[PDB]
Design a protein around this ligand. Structure first.
Ligand SMILES: [Mg+2]
Ligand SMILES: [Zn+2]
Ligand SMILES: [Zn+2]
Ligand SMILES: [Zn+2]
Ligand SMILES: [Zn+2]
Lengths: 85, 107, 171, 112, 178, 269, 84, 97, 558, 149
RNA sequence: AUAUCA
């Protein structure tokens, strides 16, 4: 239910984008569902005002052992007009 | 009008509104040493008649509520012995129009 | 009874009608809405009087929408029945429970019990009638009723009434 | 004289900073504080405690304590203030809305 | 959107009393003696005896037929057919109420001619009696001053028995011979 | 606070400044009934100078061979000398100018000449001069009556208040007072002919333009003069940096009608 | 109560606000396919149409000018001077 | 973005009555309620589909109006009610002046 | 949209403030509200016939709203009631209640002073509803006896009898939510020395108030129709519908209720408790103990910031957001949702200057123009143009985003399968992009000026900044050190006219603030203007021709 | 939701959150316009505001799975508070209070997990196992410190 | 709630 209008194609079956893929606005970096009953969409989309290429993606468990994943996204910002100096 | 030097006992002050339609006024001699009306900042106040008032309100489509108000105890309201309901016409000089007429109703 | 009442109705005219046959359409829509109408406050609004002088006034244009709204001030003939009113009418229906009497725009019903004791129901007749020692009350008969009470019911007013008291009944 | 002094004082504060504000503006403020018959302050106490509309007074500083009192005094807001019509989301009775606009079928049928 | 009146009264929060409507001459707020026409003038209640009413409606529909044809440029059983024809011309047709009203009025009117309804209206409006009674006196045919005072109970002490009985005689004399 | 206290104040269709209660704040907007945008600092000539310097500038005496208008000034110059009937009109003119001088000296006690008033009369004259290619040599086709009465008439057309009644009519006179002193100073006979060198058409045009401009200059009913005034004091307060408490903290004292003020002081003359 | 035409005392000139509102209103109506009381000399913008209608005083609108007491003076756009 | 208090003021200063109404209504908040003509409350059970109206307690199935107010005011009014205060809304006047 | 109702559309002309009569609170109510339970028909997924929708408002994208139906985006939400066990003070009046007791007899319900006292008849005369109550009080507070006979309106020898009752009046003082009296007494002429110390019950105060004459209470602030003093003490509690206190159902083990729903449940629980106590063997002091708990919960619900009293706290240590506190501050419902609110058709970005823009225009970034929309009505005049922008679509610059049919339903050109073959009809609306020369409101906050918000001509340009003419810098009080500015788009032909005809930049040049121009030549242009206009400064033919051509209205005359 | 115009059984619809609309992906008809941010809306219930300054923070999150639906605030000290009224209103909550106290056996499980170095997910299962079996007739009279163990 | 922006 309530899927994001963004695209989910860049996700491998583990629900993550592999590092190296170029992304863009509204696209889905991390796929997540919160089963309740079949299940609602709890996915993470890239900020709509940004874009770039995925730098690195790491999978871990925490102090109590909850699977959690960190995704780095790299862009190169080239001095534009309203840019402060 | 009763011009007193220092004071009028509250015993005597209770006889002030005792004889109507006639009216009594108390003025402390010390206030009157200087005529406030003569001051730079004190403009011409003119008391309006019942007909003059009626006309003012008619001409501006007013209720007495809507008029700017002079306070009954006002130094000038005292000097002119204005009664509640009575209206003054203030004629002030203007840096804008030269002459400006404002009105004030008594409290 | 039967009054002439001064009344006013707000009409909201769409811009497409802001042509010369505007007053004509307003006066028309007024008649569609008001004529025939039955209210509790005013009773049956039967006929709008003085068509040629219906006051349209200036219509205020409703801001976000295009349409103009006018308060059409008019005058009409109304029929508002009351309790205690003695009325003449024609019988319409008749049953083991009583009989309905048509009084202009409205029906007034008389209970078997709100009639004298002598008048009794006769099912064995075409059409079913009420029979007294002297009188016979049926579908065409004319009756004088005393309105006992009214019920403001939607697009009508109905009432209960007696013919038990003096100077009432068949005519 | 209270009015004349009050203006003199206001004027000085502006002109001391080497600024110019046209008379009328300062005059109006000075007059508003005046009209009541005394020195009505530009505070929750002064102006906000006058006979204006309850929603108007409530939009500045005392809000709830003004609406409770509005209730127990059974106030009636005539909705002439700009504040009221803004709260109500209606066209305020200011400039553009200070008059009404009507179509005249007379003049309408005249032009065709 | 429904119809409003000239009665402007401001019922602020205070809902009720809606005191009963009886012929103790206590009709509605709406059917009060002191009315106000669209010209603001305080004008008395207009009550019609079904004949005075018959004529009014007929007159109005007759005058309407005039304007309807103008804007288009660029014996009782006999009155029933004549009226049922005028209704087909001016009325909405869906308005069945006016059709029954006009039929009832035609069948129950005590006075046929306008002239007749004139005198009725004079004779009666000189008694000082309230428009309701003045109408019921015109529309209910009574013989005994008791028949009248029983049916129109509001009259009770308002008129002499003899004075009312004198009126009832000159009312019977006006009845148009159907 | 300034905004919230003034919000509901505006000019009504009666030129009266009222609040949401219809209570009159000002009888006429800013005592002159004019829109502030339409105002400019102008010099009231009459006000200053020596009593002798005034005389030279304003006095016309057709009954004195030295103080008449030279026939070089206007065509009627030769036939105008000794006209007792006409002199009655120049006497009124001068007598009003003297009246005005005393009056203005009463208003502006210091003798300050430069005041913000509607209609830049200086500019209208300048324009008349280029518009009509005014020949500072040849004599004018104006009459003394043309000037004197022309001005008298224009004055009656400077409308701020319209009502037909003594209260409203006296009110109109009042609002227009100051502007007229300026108008009479800038359009006195001697001035118009000797200085401006205006022709009849040039003058006729100057008059119409003062009228038009003046009328455009009045406040528009609907003007939300309340908020305007608040913001017109508010904005400048935002740019704020015997030794008496002044600036922002003083404005604070003023608006609060502060009982225990910081620098109380008397100025004893 | 409504002031008679012979007793009207408000400006004979149209206020900035009046003119802005007439132009706004006509333009709105013109835009809602209302009948246009002027030759559109190729015009397509409803405000430029409104301006044109007001320019020839062919706008069938009336300004109800309310006075602080509640009374009013009605003024036709045809009769109001447009010095703005 | 926030069209705040100070912005309301500028619009009031300009005399942009309709521009302001739009910002506050059409461009944001704007909502429609049905109110009763007797007790100027948002009580009306508008079954606008079957065209049924009712303000039970008033027994008024007739004297009903519709209004366009900012939902925050519909809220404010419901809030003032919950707090025992009655903000009765009337579509006609009774005071004059 | 929001569906059609046959009801007459009218405007609000008057607002009639008052208090709720418990009779009315009961009469409005559509539900009883009996249980402190939210929903959960014991571990379920439906609302409980008890608190939120016992019969009440509707939420959760589901119509069910008691016949009314409609659901969320139409239903205003209707009130429930709660029947209180004993009367409690409404925290806001507590003082007006106190003052009313101070004015009237705490036994017969009659004004302590009347027409017989001169100072009274004088204060009674006061026209102002509040000022008269104020004056009446300062007079009546002092009076500690209900008089039976008072000296006649002539002689002090033959005393005329007014209303009866001789009873001594208590000296009332508040003990936070409680009102306690101290009766003067008599005992051997002296006493007090040690008076009668008792707390005045809600019920007793209520009863005196019920007995206050209509004429009497009308002399006090009160109105017989809209605000009788008996209506200040709460007996029935209007329960606000979910819209006023929204709930959220997260993930079956997470659910969020509004602070009011909490505070209500406490009121209820405290109520249900005290009801059981009175019903059972009333232990007097264990009841008044439970009453002043109820008093607290009801009081703390309308106001949690009460002086003297402890705050009601919510598990996490944070104090409960009372109703008062939602209305109160800037960011309140008044200052922050009504008197100012965020809006749609708004846009904001970094401003930068431009010597090539005209004074009255504003450089609008393509992206901003492609987002902001104007709803244009399909008309013979624009039909073809509009059809083209529709064809152009949401991505091309001069394009459009939506088509609004007569029917009311919105066509999204971004997704509609018919976004190509879309055939327009007169009267429809095309929500098209903002285009060159549209009037727009430009603003730099703070906004302490009418000139801080001015109408500009659009000029769609590249790059992410709002470009402005340099001379227009001063009114806004802007610079390009990192300033951002606000843009508002009018949606009506009327609104546009307002902007173009009243607040457009050229109109604003000469300001009434100081009756002089509020925009002038600045920086480069000011610096260059001196340099250009020296006697020394002479220009050769070549440059003169470029300088001439540069003037857009140049006559062509060298 | 299903598009009234099209009606295909798998109803392909998108939530264009950014424009706040719910669209039918096929015909493009907008099916809803009022659309709310659930993240920020949930921020009003579970925030970081413990002080009490946030006007957005207006509710609190609860756990209907573990403690049912027991909404209840606590009388505590505020800024302007007398230490007297806190005691009275708290001594008054004592008379209104058995099984609403056996929830302190959750405090026995929480203090046992933290003494056994157990994660936050284990406590909430031990608290749900204990709530659904402590009042059972199948356990009847087992050692009450050995049924939570 | 802190930090920050003009
Ligand atoms: Mg900067
Ligand atoms: Zn109601
Ligand atoms: Zn509902
Ligand atoms: Zn007593
Ligand atoms: Zn579809």
């Amino acid at each position: 239910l309530r899927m994001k209008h963004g695209t989910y194609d860049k996700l491998d079956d583990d629900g993550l984008i592999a590092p190296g893929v170029r992304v863009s606005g509204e696209d889905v970096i991390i796929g997540k569902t919160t089963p309740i009953s079949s299940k609602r969409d709890a996915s993470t989309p890239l900020r709509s005002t940004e874009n770039g290429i995925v730098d690195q993606v790491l999978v871990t468990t925490n102090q109590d052992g909850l699977k959690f994943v960190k995704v780095r996204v790299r862009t190169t910002k080239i001095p534009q007009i309203g840019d402060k100096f | 009008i009763f011009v007193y030097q220092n004071n009028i006992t509250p015993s005597a002050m209770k006889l002030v509104p005792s004889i109507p339609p006639a009216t009594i006024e108390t003025f402390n001699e010390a206030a009157l040493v200087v005529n406030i009306t003569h001051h730079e900042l004190v403009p011409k106040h003119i008391r309006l008649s019942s007909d003059e008032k009626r006309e003012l309100l008619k001409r501006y489509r007013l209720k007495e509520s809507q008029l700017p108000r002079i306070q009954r105890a006002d130094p000038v309201a005292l000097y002119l012995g204005l009664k509640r309901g009575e209206v003054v016409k203030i004629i002030r000089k203007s840096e804008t129009s030269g002459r400006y007429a404002s009105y004030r109703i008594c409290m | 009874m039967f009054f002439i009442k001064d009344l006013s109705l707000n009409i909201t005219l769409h811009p497409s009608f802001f042509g010369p046959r505007m007053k004509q359409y307003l006066k028309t829509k007024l008649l569609e809405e008001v004529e025939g109408s039955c209210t509790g406050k005013f009773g049956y609004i039967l006929c709008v009087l003085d068509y040629d002088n219906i006051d349209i006034q200036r219509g205020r244009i409703l801001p976000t929408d295009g349409s103009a709204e006018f308060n059409v001030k008019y005058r009409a003939v109304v029929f508002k029945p009351f309790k205690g009113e003695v009325v003449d009418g024609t019988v319409v229906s008749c049953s083991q429970h009583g009989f309905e009497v048509q009084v202009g725009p409205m029906k007034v019903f008389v209970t078997k019990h709100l009639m004298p004791q002598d008048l009794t129901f006769n099912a064995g007749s075409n059409p079913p009638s009420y029979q007294s020692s002297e009188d016979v009350i049926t579908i065409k008969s004319r009756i004088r009723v005393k309105i006992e009470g009214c019920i403001s019911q939607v697009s009508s007013i109905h009432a209960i009434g007696s013919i038990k008291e003096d100077y009432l009944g068949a005519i | 004289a209270g009015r004349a002094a009050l203006y003199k004082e206001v004027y000085n504060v502006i002109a001391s900073d080497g600024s110019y504000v046209n008379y009328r503006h300062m005059a109006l403020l000075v007059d508003v504080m005046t009209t009541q018959g005394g020195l009505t302050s530009v505070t929750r106490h002064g102006f906000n405690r006058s006979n204006t509309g309850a929603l108007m007074r409530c939009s500045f500083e005392e809000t709830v304590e003004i609406l409770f009192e509005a209730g127990a005094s059974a106030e009636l807001d005539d909705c002439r203030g700009v504040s009221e019509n803004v709260i109500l989301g209606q066209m305020a009775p200011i400039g553009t809305g200070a008059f009404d606009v009507m179509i005249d079928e007379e003049s309408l049928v005249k032009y065709m | 959107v429904s119809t409003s009146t000239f009665q402007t009264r401001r019922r602020r929060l205070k809902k009720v009393e809606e005191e009963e409507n009886a012929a103790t001459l206590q009709l509605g707020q709406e059917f009060q003696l002191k009315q106000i026409n669209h010209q603001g003038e305080e004008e008395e209640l207009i009550a019609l005896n079904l004949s005075e009413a018959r004529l009014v409606i007929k007159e109005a529909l007759v005058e309407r037929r005039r304007a309807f044809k103008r804007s288009q440029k660029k014996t009782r059983e006999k009155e029933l057919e004549s009226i049922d024809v005028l209704l087909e011309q001016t009325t909405g047709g869906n308005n069945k109420d006016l059709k029954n009203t006009m039929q009832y009025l035609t069948n129950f009117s005590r006075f046929r001619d306008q002239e007749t309804v004139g005198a009725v209206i004079q004779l009666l409006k000189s008694t000082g009696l309230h428009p309701f009674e003045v109408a019921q006196l015109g529309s209910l045919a009574c013989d005994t001053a008791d028949e009248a005072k029983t049916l129109i109970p509001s009259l009770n002490n308002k008129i002499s028995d003899d004075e009312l009985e004198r009126i009832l005689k000159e009312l019977s004399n006006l009845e148009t011979l159907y | 606070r300034l905004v919230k206290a003034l919000e509901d104040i505006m000019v009504h269709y009666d030129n009266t400044t009222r609040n949401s209660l219809g209570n009159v704040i000002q009888f006429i907007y800013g005592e002159d009934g004019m829109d502030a945008a339409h105002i400019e600092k102008q010099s009231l000539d009459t006000i200053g100078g020596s009593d002798a310097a005034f005389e030279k500038r304003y006095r016309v005496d057709l009954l004195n061979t030295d103080h008449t208008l030279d026939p070089s000034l206007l065509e009627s110059g030769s036939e105008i000398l000794g006209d007792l009937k006409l002199q009655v009109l120049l006497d009124e003119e001068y007598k009003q100018l003297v009246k005005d001088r005393k009056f203005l000296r009463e208003v502006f006690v210091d003798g300050e000449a430069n005041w913000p008033l509607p209609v830049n009369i200086r500019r209208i004259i300048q324009n008349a001069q280029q518009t009509f290619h005014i020949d500072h040599t040849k004599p004018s086709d104006l009459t003394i009556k043309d000037i004197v009465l022309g001005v008298k008439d224009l004055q009656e057309n400077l409308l701020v208040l319209r009502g037909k009644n003594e209260i409203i009519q006296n009110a109109q006179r009042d609002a227009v007072t100051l502007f007229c002193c300026l108008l009479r100073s800038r359009l006195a006979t001697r001035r118009v002919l000797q200085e401006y060198r205006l022709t009849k058409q040039a003058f006729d045009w100057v008059l119409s333009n003062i009228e038009a401009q003046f009328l455009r200059s009045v406040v528009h009913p609907g003007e939300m003069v309340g908020v305007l005034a608040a913001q017109s004091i508010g904005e400048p307060a935002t740019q704020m940096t015997k030794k008496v408490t002044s600036g922002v903290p003083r404005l604070k004292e003023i608006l609060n009608v502060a009982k225990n003020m910081k620098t109380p002081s008397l100025t004893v003359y | 109560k409504a002031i008679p035409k012979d007793q009207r005392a408000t400006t004979p000139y149209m206020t900035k606000y009046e003119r802005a509102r007439i132009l706004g209103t006509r333009a709105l109506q013109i835009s809602m396919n209302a009948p246009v009381f002027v030759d559109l000399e190729g015009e397509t913008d409803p405000l430029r149409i409104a301006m044109k209608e007001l320019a020839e005083k062919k706008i069938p609108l009336v300004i109800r000018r309310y006075l602080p007491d509640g009374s009013f003076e009605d003024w036709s756009v045809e009769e109001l001077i447009v010095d703005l | 973005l926030r069209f705040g208090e100070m912005e309301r003021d500028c619009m009031i200063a300009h005399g942009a009555a309709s521009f302001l109404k739009e910002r506050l209504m059409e461009a944001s908040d704007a909502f429609r309620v049905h109110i009763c003509g007797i007790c100027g409350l948002m009580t009306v059970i508008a079954k606008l589909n079957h065209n049924q109206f009712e303000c039970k307690g008033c027994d008024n199935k007739i004297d009903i109006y519709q209004i366009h107010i900012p939902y925050a005011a519909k809220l404010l009014f419901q809030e003032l009610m919950a707090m025992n205060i009655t903000p009765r809304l009337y579509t006609d006047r009774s005071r004059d002046f | 949209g929001q569906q059609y109702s046959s009801a007459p559309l009218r405007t609000v002309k008057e607002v009639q403030f008052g208090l709720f009569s418990p009779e009315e609170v009961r009469a409005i109510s559509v539900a009883k509200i009996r249980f402190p339970e939210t929903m959960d028909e014991t571990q379920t997924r439906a609302k409980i016939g008890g608190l939120n929708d016992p019969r009440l408002g509707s939420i959760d994208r589901n119509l069910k709203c008691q016949t009314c139906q409609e659901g969320m985006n139409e239903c205003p939400g209707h009130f429930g009631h709660i029947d209180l066990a004993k009367p409690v003070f409404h925290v806001g009046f507590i003082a007006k209640i106190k003052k009313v007791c101070e004015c009237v007899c705490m036994h017969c319900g009659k004004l302590l002073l009347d027409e017989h006292n001169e100072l009274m008849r004088q204060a009674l005369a006061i026209k102002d509803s509040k000022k008269r109550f104020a004056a009446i009080w300062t007079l009546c507070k002092t009076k500690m006896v209900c008089e039976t006979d008072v000296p006649s309106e002539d002689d002090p020898t033959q005393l005329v009898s007014r209303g009866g009752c001789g009873n001594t009046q208590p000296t009332i003082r508040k003990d936070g939510l409680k009102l306690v009296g101290s009766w003067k007494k008599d005992r051997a002429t002296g006493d007090a020395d040690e008076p009668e110390l008792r707390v005045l019950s809600t019920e007793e105060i209520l009863n005196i108030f019920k007995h206050i004459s209509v004429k009497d209470f009308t002399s006090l602030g009160f109105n017989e129709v809209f605000s009788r003093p008996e209506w200040m003490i709460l007996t029935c509690l209007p329960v606000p519908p979910p819209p006023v206190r929204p709930s959220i159902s997260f993930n079956e083990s997470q659910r969020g209720e509004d602070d009011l729903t909490f505070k209500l449940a406490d009121i209820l629980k405290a109520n249900i408790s005290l009801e059981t106590l009175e019903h059972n063997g009333a232990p007097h002091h264990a009841i008044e103990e439970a009453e002043s708990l109820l008093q607290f919960h009801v009081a703390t619900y309308m106001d949690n910031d009460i002086a003297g009293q402890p705050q009601a706290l919510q598990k996490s240590g944070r104090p409960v957001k009372s109703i008062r506190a939602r209305l109160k501050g800037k960011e309140g419902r008044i200052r922050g949702n009504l008197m100012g609110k965020r809006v749609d058709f708004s846009a904001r970005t970094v401003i930068s200057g431009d010597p090539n823009l005209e004074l009255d225009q504003v450089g609008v970034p393509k992206s901003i123009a492609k987002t902001l929309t104007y709803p244009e009505v399909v008309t013979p005049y624009n039909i073809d143009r509009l059809t083209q922008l529709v064809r152009n679509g949401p991505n091309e610059h001069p394009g459009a985003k939506y088509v609004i049919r007569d029917s009311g339903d919105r066509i999204d050109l971004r997704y509609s399968k018919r976004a190509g073959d879309i055939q327009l009809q007169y009267g429809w609306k095309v929500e098209r992009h903002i285009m060159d020369n549209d009037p727009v409101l430009f603003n730099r906050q703070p906004s302490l000026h009418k000139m801080s918000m001015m109408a500009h001509r659009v000029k769609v340009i590249p790059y992410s900044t709002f470009r402005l003419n340099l001379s227009v810098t001063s009114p806004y009080n802007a610079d390009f050190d990192g300033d951002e500015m606000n843009l508002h788009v009018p949606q009506s032909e009327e609104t546009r006219a307002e902007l173009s005809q009243l607040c457009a930049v050229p109109l604003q040049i000469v300001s009434p603030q100081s009756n002089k121009p509020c925009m002038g030549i600045v920086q480069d242009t000011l610096c260059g203007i001196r340099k250009l206009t020296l006697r020394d400064t002479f220009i050769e033919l070549d440059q003169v021709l470029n300088m001439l051509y540069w003037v857009p209205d140049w006559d062509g005359v060298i | 939701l299903t598009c009234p115009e099209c009606k295909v059984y798998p109803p392909k619809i998108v939530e264009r959150f950014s424009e706040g609309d719910v669209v039918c992906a096929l015909c493009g008809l907008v099916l809803s316009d009022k659309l709310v941010d659930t993240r920020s809306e949930w921020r009003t219930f579970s925030n970081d505001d413990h002080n009490g300054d946030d006007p957005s923070r207006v509710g609190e999150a609860s756990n209907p799975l573990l403690d049912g639906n027991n909404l209840s605030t606590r009388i505590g000290k505020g800024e302007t508070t007398d230490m007297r009224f806190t005691k009275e209103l708290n001594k008054a909550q004592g008379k209104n209070v058995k099984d609403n106290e056996v929830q302190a056996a959750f405090a026995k499980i929480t203090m046992l997990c933290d003494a056994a170095e157990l994660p936050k997910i284990v406590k909430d299962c031990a608290k749900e196992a204990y709530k659904l079996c402590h009042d059972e007739k199948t356990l009847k009279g087992k050692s009450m410190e050995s049924i939570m163990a």
